[PDB]
Amino acid sequence: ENQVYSPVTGARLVAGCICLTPDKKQVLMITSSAHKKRWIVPKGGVEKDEPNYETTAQRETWEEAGCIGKIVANLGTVEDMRPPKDWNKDIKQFENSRKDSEVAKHPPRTEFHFYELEIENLLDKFPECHKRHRKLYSYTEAKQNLIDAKRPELLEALNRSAIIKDD
Numbered sequence: 274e275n276q277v278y279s280p281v282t283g284a285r286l287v288a289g290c291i292c293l294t295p296d297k298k299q300v301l302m303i304t305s306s307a308h309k310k311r312w313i314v315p316k317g318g319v320e321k322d323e324p325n326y327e328t329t330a331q332r333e334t335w336e337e338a339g340c341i342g343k344i345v346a347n348l349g350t351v352e353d354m355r356p357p358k359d360w361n362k363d364i365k366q367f368e369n370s371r372k373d374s375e376v377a378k379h380p381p382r383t384e385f386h387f388y389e390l391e392i393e394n395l396l397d398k399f400p401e402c403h404k405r406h407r408k409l410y411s412y413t414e415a416k417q418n419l420i421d422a423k424r425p426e427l428l429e430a431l432n433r434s435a436i437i438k439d440d
């Protein structure tokens with residue numbers, strides 16, 4: 274009941290960080306709690322008392338990755354467009370238009386507000402440090418992790434960052 278939702282779409286409002294090394298060659302990823310073998314980036318629900326998305330983003334980056342640094346860019350918004358859980362056994366599923374196919378119209382699950390952070394410190398002890406792993410990855414490696422994790426929206430956030438893509 275601390276959770277904030279879009280007054281328009283009902284999507285849950287979430288903020289997180291693309292945390293880059295000063296040389297911009299690697300990004301910090303954490304293992305998912307829902308899927309322990311899948312590598313994602315730190316993010317979490319904005320809480321009712323938080324005054325801005327930067328606050329949520331830096332709180333989640335500390336709670337989930339033991340990462341501290343400074344926000345150096347606003348990477349804007351991306352949306353979790355994954356269908357509902359009930360969808361799989363539904364009657365109508367897809368919409369087709371002559372030269373393309375799309376999944377049937379639905380509201381986003383989540384609206385993500387992402388910021389790029391320059392890592393200033395990684396600490397060995399942090400709130401979720403026994404419940405998650407956290408590791409730096411080059412662009413090529415991070416990109417493959419996020420496809421494997423089935424999170425293209427997190428890949429879109431990574432691609433807006435200043436991470437060096439010429440590995």
Ligand SMILES: [Mg+2]
Binds near residue numbers: 316317318
């Ligand atoms: Mg989270």
